N, CA, C and O atoms as a Tripos MOL2 file, in Angstrom:
@<TRIPOS>MOLECULE
protein
  252   251    63     0     0
PROTEIN
NO_CHARGES

@<TRIPOS>ATOM
      1 N        -125.3190   32.2900  -95.6160 N.3       1 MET1
      2 CA       -125.4310   32.6240  -94.1720 C.3       1 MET1
      3 C        -125.6930   34.1140  -93.9690 C.2       1 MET1
      4 O        -125.1900   34.9490  -94.7210 O.2       1 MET1
      5 N        -126.4820   34.4370  -92.9490 N.am      2 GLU2
      6 CA       -126.8090   35.8250  -92.6470 C.3       2 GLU2
      7 C        -126.2060   36.2480  -91.3110 C.2       2 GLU2
      8 O        -126.1360   35.4540  -90.3730 O.2       2 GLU2
      9 N        -125.7720   37.5010  -91.2340 N.am      3 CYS3
     10 CA       -125.1720   38.0270  -90.0120 C.3       3 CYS3
     11 C        -125.9820   39.2000  -89.4670 C.2       3 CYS3
     12 O        -127.0400   39.5360  -89.9990 O.2       3 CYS3
     13 N        -125.4760   39.8170  -88.4050 N.am      4 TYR4
     14 CA       -126.1470   40.9520  -87.7860 C.3       4 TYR4
     15 C        -125.2180   42.1600  -87.7160 C.2       4 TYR4
     16 O        -124.3350   42.2260  -86.8620 O.2       4 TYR4
     17 N        -125.4250   43.1130  -88.6190 N.am      5 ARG5
     18 CA       -124.6030   44.3180  -88.6590 C.3       5 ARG5
     19 C        -125.2700   45.4580  -87.8940 C.2       5 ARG5
     20 O        -126.4210   45.3450  -87.4720 O.2       5 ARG5
     21 N        -124.5370   46.5530  -87.7220 N.am      6 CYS6
     22 CA       -125.0560   47.7150  -87.0080 C.3       6 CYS6
     23 C        -125.0780   48.9440  -87.9120 C.2       6 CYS6
     24 O        -124.0310   49.4240  -88.3490 O.2       6 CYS6
     25 N        -126.2770   49.4480  -88.1870 N.am      7 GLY7
     26 CA       -126.4110   50.6180  -89.0360 C.3       7 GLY7
     27 C        -125.8640   51.8720  -88.3860 C.2       7 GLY7
     28 O        -124.7810   51.8550  -87.8020 O.2       7 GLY7
     29 N        -126.6150   52.9640  -88.4860 N.am      8 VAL8
     30 CA       -126.1990   54.2320  -87.9000 C.3       8 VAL8
     31 C        -127.0030   54.5440  -86.6420 C.2       8 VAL8
     32 O        -126.6410   55.4290  -85.8660 O.2       8 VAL8
     33 N        -128.0940   53.8100  -86.4470 N.am      9 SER9
     34 CA       -128.9500   54.0060  -85.2830 C.3       9 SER9
     35 C        -129.4880   52.6730  -84.7760 C.2       9 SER9
     36 O        -129.9780   52.5780  -83.6510 O.2       9 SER9
     37 N        -129.3930   51.6460  -85.6150 N.am     10 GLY10
     38 CA       -129.8720   50.3290  -85.2350 C.3      10 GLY10
     39 C        -128.7600   49.3000  -85.1950 C.2      10 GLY10
     40 O        -127.7510   49.4400  -85.8880 O.2      10 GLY10
     41 N        -128.9410   48.2630  -84.3840 N.am     11 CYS11
     42 CA       -127.9410   47.2090  -84.2590 C.3      11 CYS11
     43 C        -128.5810   45.8290  -84.3990 C.2      11 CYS11
     44 O        -128.0860   44.8470  -83.8460 O.2      11 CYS11
     45 N        -129.6800   45.7650  -85.1410 N.am     12 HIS12
     46 CA       -130.3840   44.5060  -85.3550 C.3      12 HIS12
     47 C        -130.6990   44.3050  -86.8340 C.2      12 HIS12
     48 O        -131.8260   43.9700  -87.1990 O.2      12 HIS12
     49 N        -129.6930   44.5120  -87.6790 N.am     13 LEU13
     50 CA       -129.8550   44.3630  -89.1130 C.3      13 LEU13
     51 C        -129.3270   43.0110  -89.5860 C.2      13 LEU13
     52 O        -128.2150   42.6130  -89.2390 O.2      13 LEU13
     53 N        -130.1330   42.3130  -90.3790 N.am     14 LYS14
     54 CA       -129.7550   41.0080  -90.8980 C.3      14 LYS14
     55 C        -129.2440   41.1130  -92.3310 C.2      14 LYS14
     56 O        -130.0240   41.3050  -93.2640 O.2      14 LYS14
     57 N        -127.9320   40.9870  -92.4970 N.am     15 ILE15
     58 CA       -127.3180   41.0680  -93.8170 C.3      15 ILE15
     59 C        -126.9810   39.6790  -94.3480 C.2      15 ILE15
     60 O        -127.0500   38.6920  -93.6170 O.2      15 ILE15
     61 N        -126.6160   39.6110  -95.6250 N.am     16 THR16
     62 CA       -126.2680   38.3420  -96.2540 C.3      16 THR16
     63 C        -124.8050   38.3310  -96.6820 C.2      16 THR16
     64 O        -124.3930   39.1140  -97.5380 O.2      16 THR16
     65 N        -124.0250   37.4380  -96.0810 N.am     17 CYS17
     66 CA       -122.6070   37.3240  -96.3980 C.3      17 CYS17
     67 C        -122.3950   36.4830  -97.6540 C.2      17 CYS17
     68 O        -122.6430   35.2780  -97.6530 O.2      17 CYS17
     69 N        -121.9360   37.1280  -98.7210 N.am     18 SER18
     70 CA       -121.6890   36.4370  -99.9820 C.3      18 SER18
     71 C        -120.8870   35.1600  -99.7510 C.2      18 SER18
     72 O        -120.3100   34.9650  -98.6810 O.2      18 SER18
     73 N        -120.8560   34.2960 -100.7590 N.am     19 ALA19
     74 CA       -120.1230   33.0400 -100.6640 C.3      19 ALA19
     75 C        -118.6610   33.2840 -100.3090 C.2      19 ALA19
     76 O        -117.9170   32.3460 -100.0240 O.2      19 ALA19
     77 N        -118.2580   34.5510 -100.3280 N.am     20 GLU20
     78 CA       -116.8830   34.9190 -100.0080 C.3      20 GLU20
     79 C        -116.6730   34.9680  -98.4980 C.2      20 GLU20
     80 O        -115.6810   34.4510  -97.9840 O.2      20 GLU20
     81 N        -117.6110   35.5930  -97.7950 N.am     21 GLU21
     82 CA       -117.5280   35.7100  -96.3440 C.3      21 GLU21
     83 C        -118.4820   34.7330  -95.6660 C.2      21 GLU21
     84 O        -119.6730   34.6990  -95.9760 O.2      21 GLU21
     85 N        -117.9500   33.9410  -94.7410 N.am     22 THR22
     86 CA       -118.7560   32.9620  -94.0190 C.3      22 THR22
     87 C        -118.5670   33.1050  -92.5130 C.2      22 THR22
     88 O        -119.1450   32.3490  -91.7320 O.2      22 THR22
     89 N        -117.7540   34.0770  -92.1120 N.am     23 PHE23
     90 CA       -117.4850   34.3180  -90.7030 C.3      23 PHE23
     91 C        -118.2670   35.5250  -90.1900 C.2      23 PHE23
     92 O        -118.5050   36.4810  -90.9290 O.2      23 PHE23
     93 N        -118.6620   35.4710  -88.9240 N.am     24 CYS24
     94 CA       -119.4100   36.5610  -88.3070 C.3      24 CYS24
     95 C        -118.6060   37.1820  -87.1700 C.2      24 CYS24
     96 O        -118.5530   36.6360  -86.0670 O.2      24 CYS24
     97 N        -117.9830   38.3210  -87.4430 N.am     25 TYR25
     98 CA       -117.1750   39.0080  -86.4450 C.3      25 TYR25
     99 C        -117.9420   40.1550  -85.7990 C.2      25 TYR25
    100 O        -118.5610   40.9670  -86.4870 O.2      25 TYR25
    101 N        -117.8930   40.2140  -84.4740 N.am     26 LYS26
    102 CA       -118.5710   41.2620  -83.7230 C.3      26 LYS26
    103 C        -117.6100   41.9110  -82.7340 C.2      26 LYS26
    104 O        -117.3710   41.3790  -81.6500 O.2      26 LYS26
    105 N        -117.0630   43.0610  -83.1130 N.am     27 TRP27
    106 CA       -116.1200   43.7760  -82.2600 C.3      27 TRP27
    107 C        -116.8140   44.9120  -81.5140 C.2      27 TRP27
    108 O        -117.6310   45.6340  -82.0860 O.2      27 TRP27
    109 N        -116.4830   45.0640  -80.2360 N.am     28 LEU28
    110 CA       -117.0770   46.1100  -79.4130 C.3      28 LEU28
    111 C        -116.0000   47.0000  -78.7960 C.2      28 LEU28
    112 O        -115.0390   46.5080  -78.2040 O.2      28 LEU28
    113 N        -116.1710   48.3100  -78.9410 N.am     29 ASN29
    114 CA       -115.2170   49.2710  -78.3990 C.3      29 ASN29
    115 C        -115.8160   50.0250  -77.2160 C.2      29 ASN29
    116 O        -116.4730   51.0510  -77.3900 O.2      29 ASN29
    117 N        -115.5850   49.5070  -76.0150 N.am     30 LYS30
    118 CA       -116.0990   50.1240  -74.8000 C.3      30 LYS30
    119 C        -115.4730   51.4980  -74.5780 C.2      30 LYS30
    120 O        -115.4940   52.0250  -73.4650 O.2      30 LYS30
    121 N        -114.9180   52.0720  -75.6390 N.am     31 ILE31
    122 CA       -114.2880   53.3840  -75.5570 C.3      31 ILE31
    123 C        -114.9880   54.3870  -76.4680 C.2      31 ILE31
    124 O        -115.4030   55.4580  -76.0250 O.2      31 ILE31
    125 N        -115.1140   54.0320  -77.7420 N.am     32 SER32
    126 CA       -115.7650   54.9020  -78.7160 C.3      32 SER32
    127 C        -117.1440   54.3670  -79.0860 C.2      32 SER32
    128 O        -117.6530   54.6380  -80.1740 O.2      32 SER32
    129 N        -117.7410   53.6070  -78.1740 N.am     33 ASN33
    130 CA       -119.0620   53.0320  -78.4000 C.3      33 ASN33
    131 C        -119.2290   52.5980  -79.8530 C.2      33 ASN33
    132 O        -120.3330   52.6280  -80.3960 O.2      33 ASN33
    133 N        -118.1260   52.1960  -80.4760 N.am     34 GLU34
    134 CA       -118.1500   51.7520  -81.8650 C.3      34 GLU34
    135 C        -117.8270   50.2640  -81.9600 C.2      34 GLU34
    136 O        -116.8950   49.7820  -81.3160 O.2      34 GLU34
    137 N        -118.5990   49.5430  -82.7640 N.am     35 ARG35
    138 CA       -118.3920   48.1090  -82.9360 C.3      35 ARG35
    139 C        -118.3260   47.7340  -84.4130 C.2      35 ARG35
    140 O        -119.0270   48.3130  -85.2430 O.2      35 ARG35
    141 N        -117.4770   46.7610  -84.7300 N.am     36 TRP36
    142 CA       -117.3200   46.2990  -86.1020 C.3      36 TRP36
    143 C        -118.0670   44.9870  -86.3160 C.2      36 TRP36
    144 O        -117.5010   43.9060  -86.1540 O.2      36 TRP36
    145 N        -119.3410   45.0910  -86.6810 N.am     37 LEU37
    146 CA       -120.1670   43.9130  -86.9150 C.3      37 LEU37
    147 C        -120.3050   43.6340  -88.4070 C.2      37 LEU37
    148 O        -120.6460   44.5240  -89.1860 O.2      37 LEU37
    149 N        -120.0390   42.3920  -88.7950 N.am     38 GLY38
    150 CA       -120.1360   42.0160  -90.1920 C.3      38 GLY38
    151 C        -119.5160   40.6610  -90.4710 C.2      38 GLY38
    152 O        -119.0610   39.9790  -89.5520 O.2      38 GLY38
    153 N        -119.4970   40.2690  -91.7400 N.am     39 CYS39
    154 CA       -118.9370   38.9900  -92.1370 C.3      39 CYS39
    155 C        -117.5210   39.1550  -92.6790 C.2      39 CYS39
    156 O        -117.2260   40.1150  -93.3910 O.2      39 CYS39
    157 N        -116.6500   38.2100  -92.3350 N.am     40 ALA40
    158 CA       -115.2640   38.2460  -92.7880 C.3      40 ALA40
    159 C        -114.7740   36.8520  -93.1620 C.2      40 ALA40
    160 O        -115.4950   35.8670  -93.0000 O.2      40 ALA40
    161 N        -113.5450   36.7750  -93.6610 N.am     41 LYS41
    162 CA       -112.9590   35.5010  -94.0590 C.3      41 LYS41
    163 C        -112.3750   34.7720  -92.8520 C.2      41 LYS41
    164 O        -112.7650   33.6450  -92.5490 O.2      41 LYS41
    165 N        -111.4390   35.4240  -92.1690 N.am     42 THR42
    166 CA       -110.8020   34.8380  -90.9960 C.3      42 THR42
    167 C        -111.3370   35.4660  -89.7150 C.2      42 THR42
    168 O        -112.2950   36.2390  -89.7460 O.2      42 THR42
    169 N        -110.7140   35.1290  -88.5910 N.am     43 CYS43
    170 CA       -111.1300   35.6600  -87.2990 C.3      43 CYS43
    171 C        -110.0990   36.6420  -86.7530 C.2      43 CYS43
    172 O        -108.9030   36.5120  -87.0150 O.2      43 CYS43
    173 N        -110.5720   37.6240  -85.9940 N.am     44 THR44
    174 CA       -109.6920   38.6300  -85.4080 C.3      44 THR44
    175 C        -110.1010   38.9370  -83.9710 C.2      44 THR44
    176 O        -109.9610   40.0680  -83.5040 O.2      44 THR44
    177 N        -110.6070   37.9230  -83.2760 N.am     45 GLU45
    178 CA       -111.0350   38.0790  -81.8940 C.3      45 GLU45
    179 C        -110.1240   39.0480  -81.1480 C.2      45 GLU45
    180 O        -108.8990   38.9480  -81.2280 O.2      45 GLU45
    181 N        -110.7290   39.9820  -80.4250 N.am     46 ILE46
    182 CA       -109.9780   40.9660  -79.6670 C.3      46 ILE46
    183 C        -110.5510   41.1360  -78.2650 C.2      46 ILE46
    184 O        -111.2650   42.1000  -77.9890 O.2      46 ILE46
    185 N        -110.2320   40.1940  -77.3850 N.am     47 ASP47
    186 CA       -110.7130   40.2380  -76.0090 C.3      47 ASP47
    187 C        -109.6840   40.8970  -75.0950 C.2      47 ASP47
    188 O        -108.9310   40.2150  -74.3990 O.2      47 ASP47
    189 N        -109.6600   42.2250  -75.1030 N.am     48 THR48
    190 CA       -108.7240   42.9770  -74.2750 C.3      48 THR48
    191 C        -109.4090   43.4870  -73.0130 C.2      48 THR48
    192 O        -110.1110   42.7380  -72.3330 O.2      48 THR48
    193 N        -109.2020   44.7640  -72.7050 N.am     49 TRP49
    194 CA       -109.7990   45.3690  -71.5250 C.3      49 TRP49
    195 C        -111.0120   46.2190  -71.8960 C.2      49 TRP49
    196 O        -111.9950   46.2660  -71.1560 O.2      49 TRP49
    197 N        -110.9350   46.8880  -73.0420 N.am     50 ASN50
    198 CA       -112.0230   47.7390  -73.5010 C.3      50 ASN50
    199 C        -112.6530   47.1970  -74.7810 C.2      50 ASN50
    200 O        -113.8390   47.4070  -75.0330 O.2      50 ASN50
    201 N        -111.8550   46.5010  -75.5850 N.am     51 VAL51
    202 CA       -112.3430   45.9420  -76.8410 C.3      51 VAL51
    203 C        -112.6760   44.4620  -76.6980 C.2      51 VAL51
    204 O        -111.9600   43.7160  -76.0300 O.2      51 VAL51
    205 N        -113.7700   44.0460  -77.3300 N.am     52 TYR52
    206 CA       -114.2030   42.6550  -77.2730 C.3      52 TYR52
    207 C        -114.7230   42.1880  -78.6310 C.2      52 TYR52
    208 O        -115.8780   42.4330  -78.9790 O.2      52 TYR52
    209 N        -113.8640   41.5170  -79.3910 N.am     53 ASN53
    210 CA       -114.2400   41.0140  -80.7070 C.3      53 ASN53
    211 C        -114.3870   39.4970  -80.6760 C.2      53 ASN53
    212 O        -113.5170   38.7930  -80.1630 O.2      53 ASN53
    213 N        -115.4900   38.9980  -81.2250 N.am     54 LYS54
    214 CA       -115.7430   37.5610  -81.2480 C.3      54 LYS54
    215 C        -116.2340   37.1060  -82.6170 C.2      54 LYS54
    216 O        -117.1790   37.6710  -83.1680 O.2      54 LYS54
    217 N        -115.5840   36.0800  -83.1600 N.am     55 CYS55
    218 CA       -115.9450   35.5410  -84.4580 C.3      55 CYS55
    219 C        -116.7660   34.2630  -84.3050 C.2      55 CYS55
    220 O        -116.5970   33.5200  -83.3380 O.2      55 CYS55
    221 N        -117.6520   34.0130  -85.2640 N.am     56 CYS56
    222 CA       -118.4960   32.8230  -85.2330 C.3      56 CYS56
    223 C        -118.5710   32.1710  -86.6100 C.2      56 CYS56
    224 O        -118.2830   32.8070  -87.6240 O.2      56 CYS56
    225 N        -118.9600   30.9000  -86.6370 N.am     57 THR57
    226 CA       -119.0730   30.1610  -87.8890 C.3      57 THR57
    227 C        -120.5030   29.6800  -88.1120 C.2      57 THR57
    228 O        -120.7640   28.8800  -89.0100 O.2      57 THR57
    229 N        -121.4240   30.1740  -87.2910 N.am     58 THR58
    230 CA       -122.8270   29.7940  -87.4010 C.3      58 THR58
    231 C        -123.6570   30.9370  -87.9770 C.2      58 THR58
    232 O        -123.1170   31.8640  -88.5820 O.2      58 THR58
    233 N        -124.9690   30.8650  -87.7850 N.am     59 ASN59
    234 CA       -125.8720   31.8960  -88.2850 C.3      59 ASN59
    235 C        -126.0200   33.0280  -87.2750 C.2      59 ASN59
    236 O        -125.7520   32.8510  -86.0860 O.2      59 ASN59
    237 N        -126.4470   34.1900  -87.7560 N.am     60 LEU60
    238 CA       -126.6310   35.3530  -86.8970 C.3      60 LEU60
    239 C        -125.9760   35.1370  -85.5370 C.2      60 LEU60
    240 O        -126.6080   35.3210  -84.4970 O.2      60 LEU60
    241 N        -124.7070   34.7440  -85.5540 N.am     61 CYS61
    242 CA       -123.9650   34.5020  -84.3230 C.3      61 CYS61
    243 C        -123.4550   35.8120  -83.7280 C.2      61 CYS61
    244 O        -122.8650   35.8260  -82.6480 O.2      61 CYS61
    245 N        -123.6880   36.9090  -84.4430 N.am     62 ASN62
    246 CA       -123.2530   38.2240  -83.9860 C.3      62 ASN62
    247 C        -124.4500   39.1410  -83.7510 C.2      62 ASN62
    248 O        -124.6760   40.0860  -84.5070 O.2      62 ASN62
    249 N        -125.2100   38.8550  -82.6990 N.am     63 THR63
    250 CA       -126.3820   39.6540  -82.3640 C.3      63 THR63
    251 C        -126.4270   39.9550  -80.8690 C.2      63 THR63
    252 O        -127.3490   40.6220  -80.4010 O.2      63 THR63
@<TRIPOS>BOND
     1     1     2 1
     2     2     3 1
     3     3     4 2
     4     3     5 am
     5     5     6 1
     6     6     7 1
     7     7     8 2
     8     7     9 am
     9     9    10 1
    10    10    11 1
    11    11    12 2
    12    11    13 am
    13    13    14 1
    14    14    15 1
    15    15    16 2
    16    15    17 am
    17    17    18 1
    18    18    19 1
    19    19    20 2
    20    19    21 am
    21    21    22 1
    22    22    23 1
    23    23    24 2
    24    23    25 am
    25    25    26 1
    26    26    27 1
    27    27    28 2
    28    27    29 am
    29    29    30 1
    30    30    31 1
    31    31    32 2
    32    31    33 am
    33    33    34 1
    34    34    35 1
    35    35    36 2
    36    35    37 am
    37    37    38 1
    38    38    39 1
    39    39    40 2
    40    39    41 am
    41    41    42 1
    42    42    43 1
    43    43    44 2
    44    43    45 am
    45    45    46 1
    46    46    47 1
    47    47    48 2
    48    47    49 am
    49    49    50 1
    50    50    51 1
    51    51    52 2
    52    51    53 am
    53    53    54 1
    54    54    55 1
    55    55    56 2
    56    55    57 am
    57    57    58 1
    58    58    59 1
    59    59    60 2
    60    59    61 am
    61    61    62 1
    62    62    63 1
    63    63    64 2
    64    63    65 am
    65    65    66 1
    66    66    67 1
    67    67    68 2
    68    67    69 am
    69    69    70 1
    70    70    71 1
    71    71    72 2
    72    71    73 am
    73    73    74 1
    74    74    75 1
    75    75    76 2
    76    75    77 am
    77    77    78 1
    78    78    79 1
    79    79    80 2
    80    79    81 am
    81    81    82 1
    82    82    83 1
    83    83    84 2
    84    83    85 am
    85    85    86 1
    86    86    87 1
    87    87    88 2
    88    87    89 am
    89    89    90 1
    90    90    91 1
    91    91    92 2
    92    91    93 am
    93    93    94 1
    94    94    95 1
    95    95    96 2
    96    95    97 am
    97    97    98 1
    98    98    99 1
    99    99   100 2
   100    99   101 am
   101   101   102 1
   102   102   103 1
   103   103   104 2
   104   103   105 am
   105   105   106 1
   106   106   107 1
   107   107   108 2
   108   107   109 am
   109   109   110 1
   110   110   111 1
   111   111   112 2
   112   111   113 am
   113   113   114 1
   114   114   115 1
   115   115   116 2
   116   115   117 am
   117   117   118 1
   118   118   119 1
   119   119   120 2
   120   119   121 am
   121   121   122 1
   122   122   123 1
   123   123   124 2
   124   123   125 am
   125   125   126 1
   126   126   127 1
   127   127   128 2
   128   127   129 am
   129   129   130 1
   130   130   131 1
   131   131   132 2
   132   131   133 am
   133   133   134 1
   134   134   135 1
   135   135   136 2
   136   135   137 am
   137   137   138 1
   138   138   139 1
   139   139   140 2
   140   139   141 am
   141   141   142 1
   142   142   143 1
   143   143   144 2
   144   143   145 am
   145   145   146 1
   146   146   147 1
   147   147   148 2
   148   147   149 am
   149   149   150 1
   150   150   151 1
   151   151   152 2
   152   151   153 am
   153   153   154 1
   154   154   155 1
   155   155   156 2
   156   155   157 am
   157   157   158 1
   158   158   159 1
   159   159   160 2
   160   159   161 am
   161   161   162 1
   162   162   163 1
   163   163   164 2
   164   163   165 am
   165   165   166 1
   166   166   167 1
   167   167   168 2
   168   167   169 am
   169   169   170 1
   170   170   171 1
   171   171   172 2
   172   171   173 am
   173   173   174 1
   174   174   175 1
   175   175   176 2
   176   175   177 am
   177   177   178 1
   178   178   179 1
   179   179   180 2
   180   179   181 am
   181   181   182 1
   182   182   183 1
   183   183   184 2
   184   183   185 am
   185   185   186 1
   186   186   187 1
   187   187   188 2
   188   187   189 am
   189   189   190 1
   190   190   191 1
   191   191   192 2
   192   191   193 am
   193   193   194 1
   194   194   195 1
   195   195   196 2
   196   195   197 am
   197   197   198 1
   198   198   199 1
   199   199   200 2
   200   199   201 am
   201   201   202 1
   202   202   203 1
   203   203   204 2
   204   203   205 am
   205   205   206 1
   206   206   207 1
   207   207   208 2
   208   207   209 am
   209   209   210 1
   210   210   211 1
   211   211   212 2
   212   211   213 am
   213   213   214 1
   214   214   215 1
   215   215   216 2
   216   215   217 am
   217   217   218 1
   218   218   219 1
   219   219   220 2
   220   219   221 am
   221   221   222 1
   222   222   223 1
   223   223   224 2
   224   223   225 am
   225   225   226 1
   226   226   227 1
   227   227   228 2
   228   227   229 am
   229   229   230 1
   230   230   231 1
   231   231   232 2
   232   231   233 am
   233   233   234 1
   234   234   235 1
   235   235   236 2
   236   235   237 am
   237   237   238 1
   238   238   239 1
   239   239   240 2
   240   239   241 am
   241   241   242 1
   242   242   243 1
   243   243   244 2
   244   243   245 am
   245   245   246 1
   246   246   247 1
   247   247   248 2
   248   247   249 am
   249   249   250 1
   250   250   251 1
   251   251   252 2
@<TRIPOS>SUBSTRUCTURE
     1 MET1         2 RESIDUE 1 A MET
     2 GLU2         6 RESIDUE 1 A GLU
     3 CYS3        10 RESIDUE 1 A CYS
     4 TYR4        14 RESIDUE 1 A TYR
     5 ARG5        18 RESIDUE 1 A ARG
     6 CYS6        22 RESIDUE 1 A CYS
     7 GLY7        26 RESIDUE 1 A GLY
     8 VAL8        30 RESIDUE 1 A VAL
     9 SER9        34 RESIDUE 1 A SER
    10 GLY10       38 RESIDUE 1 A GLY
    11 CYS11       42 RESIDUE 1 A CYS
    12 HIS12       46 RESIDUE 1 A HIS
    13 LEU13       50 RESIDUE 1 A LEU
    14 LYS14       54 RESIDUE 1 A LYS
    15 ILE15       58 RESIDUE 1 A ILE
    16 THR16       62 RESIDUE 1 A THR
    17 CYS17       66 RESIDUE 1 A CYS
    18 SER18       70 RESIDUE 1 A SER
    19 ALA19       74 RESIDUE 1 A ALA
    20 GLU20       78 RESIDUE 1 A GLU
    21 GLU21       82 RESIDUE 1 A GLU
    22 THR22       86 RESIDUE 1 A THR
    23 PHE23       90 RESIDUE 1 A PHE
    24 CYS24       94 RESIDUE 1 A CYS
    25 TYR25       98 RESIDUE 1 A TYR
    26 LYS26      102 RESIDUE 1 A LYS
    27 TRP27      106 RESIDUE 1 A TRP
    28 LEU28      110 RESIDUE 1 A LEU
    29 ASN29      114 RESIDUE 1 A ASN
    30 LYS30      118 RESIDUE 1 A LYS
    31 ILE31      122 RESIDUE 1 A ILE
    32 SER32      126 RESIDUE 1 A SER
    33 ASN33      130 RESIDUE 1 A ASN
    34 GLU34      134 RESIDUE 1 A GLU
    35 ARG35      138 RESIDUE 1 A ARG
    36 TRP36      142 RESIDUE 1 A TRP
    37 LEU37      146 RESIDUE 1 A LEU
    38 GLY38      150 RESIDUE 1 A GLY
    39 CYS39      154 RESIDUE 1 A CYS
    40 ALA40      158 RESIDUE 1 A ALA
    41 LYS41      162 RESIDUE 1 A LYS
    42 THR42      166 RESIDUE 1 A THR
    43 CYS43      170 RESIDUE 1 A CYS
    44 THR44      174 RESIDUE 1 A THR
    45 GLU45      178 RESIDUE 1 A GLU
    46 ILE46      182 RESIDUE 1 A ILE
    47 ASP47      186 RESIDUE 1 A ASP
    48 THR48      190 RESIDUE 1 A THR
    49 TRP49      194 RESIDUE 1 A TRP
    50 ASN50      198 RESIDUE 1 A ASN
    51 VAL51      202 RESIDUE 1 A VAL
    52 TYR52      206 RESIDUE 1 A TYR
    53 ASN53      210 RESIDUE 1 A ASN
    54 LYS54      214 RESIDUE 1 A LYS
    55 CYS55      218 RESIDUE 1 A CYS
    56 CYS56      222 RESIDUE 1 A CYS
    57 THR57      226 RESIDUE 1 A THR
    58 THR58      230 RESIDUE 1 A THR
    59 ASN59      234 RESIDUE 1 A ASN
    60 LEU60      238 RESIDUE 1 A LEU
    61 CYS61      242 RESIDUE 1 A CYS
    62 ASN62      246 RESIDUE 1 A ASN
    63 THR63      250 RESIDUE 1 A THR
């Protein structure tokens, strides 16, 4: 499965999650304009007031 990570200037990068990671987590920090996009094992959804993290089990579900 492939996900969508964010480089240093771009946010449309298609990476490949090894057989180890099959989850697509996309966290957004409406404070430090910083987001944690990548593949992980479990989910850590963070839907607060400024932060918004969403995990997926499909393809490029984090774009």
